[PDB]
Write a protein that binds this ligand. Structure first.
Ligand SMILES: [K+]
Lengths: 248, 242, 204, 237, 216, 242, 220, 231, 196
């Protein structure tokens, strides 16, 4: 029925897709997730928005999703659409593994998921996936990578980016502070903690409110390890010492 | 009762979580102008409906709301007549398919749940309207005894000790509640007494036998039986003498 | 027959807190050796292996599809698969093609990733699991494998004797089979290590 | 399946969805293409100059085949879809017809795809305009564009996106037999066309070149800077 | 029907001056067994045409159902036009050809007889869709046994009266009962005229056995 | 009453009325009246078929269809939908005879066609039929049956019914009959009388009476009334109309 | 394969061997063939082992879902009807020969379901390769309304006759005693056969096998 | 017959799916439901305040078992709860047929959330108006989950949903700790229900279900009487 | 029956194939090329039933070239071999199976030389040397006798000529000319045809 149709997959008079833009506003109100590409690794740091102390947090992580042996992603936006997208990402990675018997290059997986999002903003009348993802990976072609995705199906290779609440301020700070090709894993972790300090202004950045996962290479095997509470506490305390030292 | 968008036209949520099309379907049940009363006892279930013949040219044998779902389950339908006949046809089909697939006769609660699931599908999708009719199924379960079940357009079903649906379901519900709270060990005679008494005291009619329909099931005779004019007249005379 | 096209030979054996899986390494076409290093045992976890024998193409297809399904399962559930669940997964995968079956009879040999209790099973080409406490064999010389295993297996063996028994069984079984052999590979899955070693077999 | 008619004729005979796709193209980054004697040059403006980005992943000039390459203005994701279908069609034509695709053939395929989306049920038109360049088998350079409406024409030089009219006027005033005499002159013509609209020189220019019997070459920033310096000396005099 | 189960034997038909007459015995044989001994194999399709069918009686029953329903719909329309015997023959030929093409033949060979517009119609159609018109038609073993007599009568005398045609059909069915293993003594005779379709039976044909004493 | 809730049969009004079905009924009450009366040995139909232009042939736009060898059908409303429903009823009777091997009871044909027309009172993708119709049959083992189906899809048996513009007047004059004791030869005469009474010669200038009965007189076959009997019935109706 | 079932005074005794074969060579010596259909219904399995396993699992899942929906103990007729309809649909290609038995609100019930969809309600049914011997023992000794122990001994004798007189059956006897109040899954009820004690010592000392290459892969 | 093929749930200009908000409003307007994860179990409690004595309390249940070790309770529209219960039973049976192992509670929650997501985006359908509390015991550990109408599932140690769900959550937050046994959890869940219950709460107007090593089971009215008397 | 052969050296893959295309007792072509260049460093030597071979080789070639154009980096010989195996195995049980016997030669910067063997059932096997056709029976014995892992390319050509001379001496079919190609880190190199 044309009367009840929401006309999701149509153009605006000024040539923009309202549904994609609205989903992007939704994402901009979502949890902050930033990733930094280092020389010896790549990390994802994500604000957890559900902090209520009656939560259990049984799983491996609440924001970081392991996509294959050599890749991981974060999410800003709607959680259920995130779940369907991450399942589709796992399916695509395993389909390449079955077809070619080698791990999928990161950009190919990003491109496939972005093509699906484009399909949802091109035809069918369905609302777009209000999920922006933040990929981290490694392949034998371009090494450590960090990728952003948008509901419109756009993607970009980033060396430091942030998606979610207070994303513009985090991007400005990253632009000021990121050192090209000279940032190690520990430097990237410190920068992530510093950026999350000025992004979670209201929450004061406890270690219970951030989820950090690093992707490094060890003995020819990729290891994706969620940072423990103890070592996130150590990172936060070190940043506090540095902030106090700045007063000196 | 807020409203935004097409929430009053298709089955989508109002800002308060209300589906207005379902409530309009309940109003459509009311639109039939008739009311039905069901009550179960120790070993029986009785459904009594209001039988109105607006025109003397109708064949009164063909104007009924008691429908025989299977050989052992009865049904009184209140609301839009075409929708009610669709729902009774569907109930017959589901019961027959249950017997074919599972080898034993469908329990009344199972049939009511299937019809309620179909109604839920109506109140979930946006292209079809809910049926503006209400079903009250009765039967004898092998273990649990007499069953009285009702399914409304919302997709809700529940078993009742005594229920009613139609233009005067609230007054009939209050009367049956007052009678139930006493718990005086209903028999078949007392069950038909209380059903007819509820219908008459709510409508203020004092029916002659041709203005109502009575359908009963019994533990002794699990067959669904639609009482004829003689039996209904006998029960009404029993009402009069008291 | 269709199973004798490319030969093949796999067995598994239980021990005390350790499990063994062995296979031949010959890939051939009805008479003609092509390679002497065919992989018939695949790693399905840290302490879980599956050994496919039968048609080489179906061996590879089943192994790769099972790795597909297992990787998706592990990612979704966040735990290493249990051997019994792996056996059920393989049974479902082989019964999906009940009327077009893959011509492989897998053997699964591993340890419980919480209890480290040894597990060995075998399945037919259409998905009939068979969990034994002593030994499971599959291949075109299954009769010789039965004979040697029955004459040799003793309960509650240490990894050394487990390796010795599975090695002697496989070697003397494949020596009496023309289309299976050309080297034997054995894995001894233990509590805290896997030791894979290659035997000195006849190459005729 | 969704079957609403997204693109329908409005009064006065306008297809509003196509016009809106063209408006989306107008807001895209400026892309310029020039056809020379023995070289074909494509250039795109980079408003996304942001320095925390991997330049490889936001390339707006893609090689459809060994002898065909294109640059787009408009939505990036629709451009990715059209590029992928164009590559698939190039390879299919090479299997079926044994020869490499001529530029006009893949241009016709892309235009037909865009037009089909203009007229088929339940999908919006591609909000991309293309610049399909390349060399034919006989060594004749070519340059086409495909607007969202599905019309394709051959151009000696053109611009799509924002500032298309300004760069088109510049090319009209500055495309002569002498301006494309050599490869460097064509490079400088495309860079000069972009400089009419880009905010700052060099850093906001992506420039790919294709010459006979050679694949597409992405000119590195140093080459762009040295060329821009050459235009600076030329403009001084 | 890839293989028949219960089969009807020869069905006859000869044109005459004023209509046609078709005769078929009342037997459905399961191979050698004479299982169903009083089944009618002649259909009155409408007031102007009739249909006698050899072969499978199940397929004949299905086709009888389809034709009867088609005639019922025709009558429902009530617009004067009605199916001629030629139209029934053509529809039957098309149906049987369609069924052979799908490799699911209707294992019947059928004789359509009719009388419309003062013209006598005798039509043939088999499981393979072979159709034609002749003054006399015989099916199965009737083609070898009965048809020679029909042809030798109709070649000398092209047009026969009702009584002559009936006598010739009776003689032919007597010969068939003599020399066909799948024949039955009881049979029906159906005639179309200006008056319509009339089915007479169960008729029995008289037999002579005086050569039994000769054989020794 | 509407303008926001009358756009689709898949929408309920705030008071539970499907306005599209009511508009279909509005359509059917703007058509010439067709009456049917049931007697001891059959049912006789009657139609005041208006002739819009005299260029038409006598018998154009018949409103007395013949849906099976023993079932008639009188229609009112949009004639395209009436013909479509006639074909649906014909197909239902044909399928019944093909599957179950005997003639469809009219009590079942009415139910099947009523459910078919009810299926069009639920969805926004279709519209309710703009025609209410009558079905009439007589079989020796089931007696004479007369049923009406309206756009909603309600089926009831009638001893006499009217559909069209002059439903009320036709029913008022039918009630004066004693059809339960009369025979077809007299019921046709009375049907002509009723049609000529309810017709208005000032608004709709000319009409031709179309009659048909099914009953014992016709061995269960539903046939158009013979020309001589129609002439006698019209003669009586004109003389009575004085 | 030998599977037997009997209706005794209070329920069902289902019996089965524990030998699975691939040709004339034994593959499993302790295979389980009395499958779990529901808490009150068990199915003995013959024919194609994969086919019977999968059909019993599918019907058990269907029946569990049905019981959850209805909130009642599953009925044996329901399992019979599902099994026979689904086997008929496959037109005998699912070679599941089954002996179905269970106790429900209507009492003990024993069914014999054949691959093509046929079902035979009988007081005692024997299926499998060694069905003839078990059926002979039944016809010789079965009497209606036996006690629990008598029926158990009868089914044990039937399965033993299947074991010792058929080459496709053996290696143990399993029983399942389904009654109104209790379920007994006896695995194994008897062990009429046992491999003899190995006389000689064939233990392979370490170093007997020659190793060409070696790789240790330490784990967590 | 063909249904609509366009999303009824779409992003508002504010950047928010208002249909999910209205479904959550329907959830917040339903009967209170509470869930408490004990150290050796988890309790699911909800009120069954029928609006007349005529309703048979044993006819319908709000705490429905899914497997032998998983149960769930809701707060919202009952018919949608029935649909999701049937779908969850189907998913559990499919998992059991595939893996021959009882479905992990987390996996079942994920699949139910996937169904909810489907109904959030699929054409011509409205989001479910129920939030579920899926309880289960597996891997030697109790579990408790909540799946909002959008299909987002949260692991919870104790939560309340329905009317006065914020006040019930504050109650639980004040009076929940790790070391609670199952009996303490049942007592605390009953108190949380009492915090918003209007009138005298009895055996038939609350429905309590537990799951432990023995599996999931609804508490019979006599057991609920015993627990209620303890207050 | 057609002939293929491959010899994997330390830094090359030498492949040879007969050039005879016979569709009767007569040879229709004497310069047939049964090697397909899938990429700058991959060769697919396809033999088998007619029609199937060219269609399957061109399908895999189209897909490998599409991967190169779509991604900017070529498929590794291992990845191309596994893709070919997946396609053949998927079509194994399809309505239109491909009856082709394959050799996939390639070079990779990291994996080094690679030679892959595929039968018509799609059974992949990496081998130091491989062959197809009835000539494999006569030539693989010589390959076993004389091949060493550190064989030079000139000695590899000599060994291949020994194999071809064995075919000319003790094989019934007349295969006079063989194509010879070597895949080194520089790409696919055409060597002179070995004729007789
Ligand atoms: K609706």
């Amino acid at each position: 029925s044309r009367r009840y149709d929401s006309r999701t997959t149509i153009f605006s008079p000024e040539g923009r897709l309202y549904q994609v833009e609205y989903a992007m506003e939704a994402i901009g109100h979502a949890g902050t997730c930033l990733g930094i590409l280092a020389n010896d690794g790549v990390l994802l740091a994500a604000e957890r928005r559900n902090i209520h102390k009656l939560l259990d947090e049984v799983f491996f992580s609440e924001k970081i999703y392991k996509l294959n042996e050599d890749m991981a992603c974060s999410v800003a936006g709607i959680t259920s659409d995130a779940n369907v997208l991450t399942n589709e990402l796992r399916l695509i990675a395993q389909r390449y593994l079955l077809q070619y018997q080698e791990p999928i290059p990161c950009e190919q997986l990003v491109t496939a998921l972005c093509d699906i999002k484009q399909a949802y903003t091109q035809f069918g009348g369905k609302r777009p996936f209000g999920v922006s993802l933040l990929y981290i990976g490694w392949d034998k072609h371009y090494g450590f990578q960090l990728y952003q995705s948008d509901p419109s199906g756009n993607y970009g290779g980033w060396k430091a980016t942030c998606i979610g609440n207070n994303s513009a301020a985090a991007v400005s700070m990253l632009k000021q502070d990121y050192k090209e090709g000279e940032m190690t894993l520990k430097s990237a972790l410190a920068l992530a903690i510093k950026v999350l300090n000025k992004t979670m202004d209201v929450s004061k950045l406890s270690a219970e409110k951030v989820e950090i996962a690093t992707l490094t290479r060890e003995n020819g095997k990729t290891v994706i390890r969620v940072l423990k509470q103890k070592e996130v506490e150590q990172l936060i305390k070190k940043h506090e010492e540095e902030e106090a030292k700045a007063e000196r | 009762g807020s409203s935004a968008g097409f929430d009053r036209h298709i089955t989508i949520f109002s800002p308060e979580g209300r589906l207005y099309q379902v409530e309009y379907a309940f109003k459509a049940i009311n639109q039939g102008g008739l009311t039905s009363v069901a009550v179960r006892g120790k070993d029986c279930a009785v459904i009594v409906t209001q039988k109105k013949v607006p025109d003397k040219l109708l064949d009164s044998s063909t104007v009924t709301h008691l429908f025989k779902i299977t050989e052992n389950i009865g049904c009184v339908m209140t609301g839009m007549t075409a929708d009610s006949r669709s729902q009774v046809q569907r109930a017959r089909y589901e019961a027959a398919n249950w017997k074919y697939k599972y080898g034993y006769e469908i329990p009344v609660d199972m049939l009511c749940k299937r019809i309620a699931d179909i109604s839920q599908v109506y109140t979930q999708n946006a292209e079809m309207r809910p049926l503006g009719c209400c079903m009250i199924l009765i039967g004898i379960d092998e273990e649990q005894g007499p069953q009285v079940y009702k399914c409304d357009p919302a997709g809700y079903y529940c078993g009742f000790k005594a229920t009613a649906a139609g233009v005067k379901q609230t007054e009939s519900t209050s009367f049956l509640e007052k009678k139930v709270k006493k718990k005086f060990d209903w028999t078949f005679e007392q069950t038909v007494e209380t059903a007819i008494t509820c219908l008459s005291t709510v409508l203020s009619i004092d029916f002659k036998p041709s203005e109502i329909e009575v359908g009963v099931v019994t533990v002794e005779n699990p067959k669904f039986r639609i009482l004829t004019e003689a039996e209904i007249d006998a029960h009404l005379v029993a009402l009069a003498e008291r | 027959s269709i199973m004798s096209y490319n030969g093949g030979a796999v067995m598994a054996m239980k021990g005390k807190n350790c499990v063994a899986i062995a296979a031949d390494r010959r890939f051939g076409i009805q008479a003609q050796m092509v390679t002497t290093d065919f992989q018939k045992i695949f790693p399905m976890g840290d302490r879980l292996y599956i050994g496919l024998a039968g048609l080489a193409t179906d061996v590879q297809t089943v192994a790769q599809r099972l790795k597909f399904r297992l990787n998706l399962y592990e990612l979704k559930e966040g735990r290493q698969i249990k051997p019994y669940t792996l056996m059920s997964m393989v049974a479902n995968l082989l019964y999906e093609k009940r009327f077009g079956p893959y011509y492989t009879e897998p053997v699964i040999a591993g340890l419980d990733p919480k209890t480290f209790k040894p597990f060995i099973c075998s399945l037919d080409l259409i998905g009939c699991p068979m969990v034994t406490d002593d030994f499971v064999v599959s291949g075109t010389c299954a009769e010789q494998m039965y004979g040697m295993c029955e004459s040799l297996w003793e309960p509650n063996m240490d990894p050394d004797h487990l390796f010795e028994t599975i090695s002697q069984a496989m070697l003397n079984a494949v020596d009496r089979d023309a289309v299976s052999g050309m080297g034997v590979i054995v894995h001894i899955i233990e509590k805290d290590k896997i030791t894979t070693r290659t035997l000195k077999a006849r190459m005729d | 399946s969704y079957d609403r008619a997204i693109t329908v004729f409005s009064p006065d005979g306008h297809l509003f969805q196509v016009e809106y796709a063209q408006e989306a193209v107008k807001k895209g980054s400026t892309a310029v293409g020039v056809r020379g004697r023995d070289i074909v040059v494509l250039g795109v403006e980079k408003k996304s100059v942001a320095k925390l980005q991997d330049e490889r992943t936001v390339r707006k000039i893609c090689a459809l085949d060994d002898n065909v390459c294109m640059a787009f203005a408009g939505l990036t994701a629709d451009a990715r879809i059209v590029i992928n279908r164009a590559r698939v069609e190039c390879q299919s034509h090479r299997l079926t017809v044994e020869d490499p695709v001529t530029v006009e053939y893949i241009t016709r395929y892309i235009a037909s795809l865009k037009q089909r989306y203009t007229q088929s049920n339940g999908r919006r038109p591609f909000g991309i305009s293309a610049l399909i360049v390349g060399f034919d088998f006989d060594g004749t350079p070519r340059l086409y564009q495909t607007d969202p409406s599905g019309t394709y024409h051959a151009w000696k030089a053109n611009a799509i996106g924002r500032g298309a009219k300004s760069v088109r006027e510049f090319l009209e005033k500055n495309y002569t037999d002498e301006a494309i005499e050599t490869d460097d002159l064509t490079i400088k013509l495309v860079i000069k066309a972009l400089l009419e609209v880009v905010q700052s020189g060099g850093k906001n220019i992506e420039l790919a070149v294709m010459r006979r019997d050679q694949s597409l070459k992405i000119l590195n920033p140093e080459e762009i800077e040295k060329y821009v310096a050459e235009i600076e000396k030329e403009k001084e005099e | 029907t890839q293989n028949p189960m219960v089969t009807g034997t020869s069905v006859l038909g000869v044109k005459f001056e004023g209509g046609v007459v078709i005769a078929a015995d009342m037997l459905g044989s399961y191979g050698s067994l004479a299982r169903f001994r009083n089944i009618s194999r002649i259909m009155r399709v409408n007031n102007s045409t009739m249909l006698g069918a050899s072969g499978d009686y199940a397929d004949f029953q299905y086709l009888k159902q389809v034709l009867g329903q088609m005639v019922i719909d025709e009558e429902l329309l009530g617009d004067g036009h009605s199916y001629s015997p030629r139209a029934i023959h053509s529809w039957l030929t098309r149906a049987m050809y369609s069924r052979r093409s799908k490799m699911n033949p209707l294992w019947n060979t059928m004789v359509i007889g009719g009388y419309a517009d003062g013209e006598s119609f005798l039509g043939y159609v088999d499981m393979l869709g072979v159709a034609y018109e002749a003054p006399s038609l015989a099916t199965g073993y009737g083609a070898y046994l009965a048809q020679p007599l029909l042809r030798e009568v109709l070649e000398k005398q092209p047009v026969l009266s009702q009584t002559e045609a009936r006598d010739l059909v009776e003689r032919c069915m007597r010969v068939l009962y003599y020399r066909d293993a799948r024949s039955y003594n009881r049979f029906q005779i159906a005639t179309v005229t200006e008056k319509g379709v009339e089915i007479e039976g169960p008729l029995s044909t008289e037999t002579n056995w005086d050569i039994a004493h000769m054989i020794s | 009453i509407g303008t926001g809730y009358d756009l689709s049969a898949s929408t309920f009004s705030p008071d539970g009325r499907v306005f599209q079905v009511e508009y279909a009924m509005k359509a059917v009450e703007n058509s010439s009246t067709a009456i049917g009366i049931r007697c001891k040995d059959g049912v006789v139909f009657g139609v005041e078929k208006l002739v819009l232009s005299k260029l038409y042939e006598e018998g154009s736009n018949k409103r007395l269809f013949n849906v099976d060898r023993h079932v008639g059908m009188a229609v009112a409303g949009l004639l395209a939908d009436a013909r479509s429903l006639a074909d649906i009823a014909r197909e239902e009777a044909s399928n019944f005879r093909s599957n179950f091997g005997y003639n469809i009871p009219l009590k079942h044909l009415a139910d099947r066609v009523a459910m078919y027309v009810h299926a069009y009172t639920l969805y926004s993708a279709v519209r309710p039929f703009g025609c209410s119709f009558m079905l009439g049959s007589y079989s020796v083992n089931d007696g004479a049956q007369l049923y009406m189906i309206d756009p909603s899809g309600v089926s009831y048996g009638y001893w006499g019914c009217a559909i069209g513009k002059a439903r009320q007047a036709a029913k008022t004059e039918i009630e004066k009959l004693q059809m339960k004791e009369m025979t077809c030869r007299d019921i046709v005469k009375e049907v002509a009388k009723i049609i000529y009474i309810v017709h208005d010669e000032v608004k709709d200038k000319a009409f031709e009476l179309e009659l048909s009965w099914v009953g014992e007189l016709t061995n269960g076959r539903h046939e158009i009334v013979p020309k001589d009997i129609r002439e006698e019935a019209e003669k009586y109706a004109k003389e009575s109309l004085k | 394969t030998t599977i037997a079932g009997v209706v005794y005074k209070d329920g069902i005794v289902l019996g089965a061997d524990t030998r699975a074969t691939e040709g004339m060579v034994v593959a499993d010596k302790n295979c389980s063939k009395i499958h779990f259909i529901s808490p009150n219904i068990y199915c003995c399995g013959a024919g194609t082992a994969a086919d019977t396993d999968m059909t019993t699992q599918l019907i058990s899942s269907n029946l569990e879902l049905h019981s959850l929906s209805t909130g009642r103990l599953p009925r044996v007729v329901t399992a019979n009807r599902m099994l026979k309809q689904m086997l008929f649909r496959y037109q005998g290609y699912i070679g599941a020969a089954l002996v179905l038995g269970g106790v429900d609100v209507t009492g003990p019930h024993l069914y014999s379901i054949y691959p093509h969809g046929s079902t035979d309600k009988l007081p005692y049914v024997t299926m499998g390769s060694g069905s003839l011997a078990a059926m002979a023992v039944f016809e010789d000794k079965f009497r209606p309304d036996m006690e629990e122990e008598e029926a158990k001994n009868l089914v044990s004798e039937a399965i033993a006759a299947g074991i010792f007189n058929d080459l496709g059956s053996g290696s143990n006897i399993d029983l399942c005693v389904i009654s109104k109040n209790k379920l007994d899954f006896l695995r194994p009820y008897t062990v009429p056969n046992k491999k003899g004690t190995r006389l000689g010592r064939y233990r392979c000392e370490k170093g007997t096998t020659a190793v060409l290459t070696e790789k240790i892969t330490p784990l967590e | 017959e063909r249904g609509y093929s366009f999303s009824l749930t779409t992003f508002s200009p504010s950047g928010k799916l208002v249909q999910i908000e209205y479904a959550l409003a329907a959830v917040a307007g339903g009967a209170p439901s509470v869930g408490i994860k004990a150290a050796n179990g988890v309790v699911l409690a909800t009120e069954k305040k029928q609006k007349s004595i005529l309703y048979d309390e044993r006819s319908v249940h709000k705490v429905e078992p899914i497997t032998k070790h998983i149960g769930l309770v809701y707060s919202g529209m009952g018919p949608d709860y029935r649909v999701l219960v049937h779908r969850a039973r189907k998913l559990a049976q499919q998992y059991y047929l595939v893996y021959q192992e009882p479905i992990p509670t987390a996996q079942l929650v994920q699949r139910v959330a996937s169904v909810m997501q489907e109904y959030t985006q699929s054409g011509g359908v409205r989001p479910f108006g129920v939030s579920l509390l899926i309880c289960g015991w597996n891997e030697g550990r109790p579990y408790l989950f909540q799946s909002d109408p959008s299909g987002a599932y949260f692991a919870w140690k104790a939560t309340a949903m329905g009317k006065n769900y914020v006040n019930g959550k504050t109650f639980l937050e004040k009076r929940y700790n790790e070391d609670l046994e199952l009996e303490d959890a049942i007592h605390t869940a009953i108190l949380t229900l009492k915090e918003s219950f209007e009138g005298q709460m009895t055996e038939d107007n609350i429905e309590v279900g537990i799951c432990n090593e023995a599996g999931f089971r609804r508490l019979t009215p006599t057991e609920v009487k015993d627990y209620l008397a303890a207050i | 029956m057609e002939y293929l052969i491959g010899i994997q050296g330390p830094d090359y893959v030498l492949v040879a194939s007969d050039r005879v295309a016979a569709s009767n007792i007569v040879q229709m072509k004497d310069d047939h090329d049964k090697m397909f260049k899938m990429s700058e460093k991959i060769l697919l030597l396809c033999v088998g039933e007619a029609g199937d071979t060219v269609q399957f080789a061109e399908y895999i070639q189209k897909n490998v070239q599409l991967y190169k154009m779509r991604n900017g980096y070529e498929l590794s010989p291992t990845a191309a071999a596994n893709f070919t195996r997946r396609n053949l195995a998927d079509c194994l049980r399809s309505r239109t199976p491909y009856h082709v016997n394959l050799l996939l030669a390639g070079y990779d910067e990291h994996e080094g030389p690679a030679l892959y063997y595929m039968d018509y059932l799609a059974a992949l096997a990496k081998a130091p040397f491989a062959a197809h056709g009835y000539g494999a029976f006569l030539t693989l014995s010589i390959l076993d006798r004389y091949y060493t892992p550190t064989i030079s390319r000139e000695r590899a050509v000599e060994l291949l000529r020994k194999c071809l001379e064995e075919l000319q001496k003790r094989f019934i079919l007349n295969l006079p000319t063989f194509s010879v190609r070597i895949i080194d880190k520089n790409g696919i190199h055409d060597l002179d045809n070995i004729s007789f």
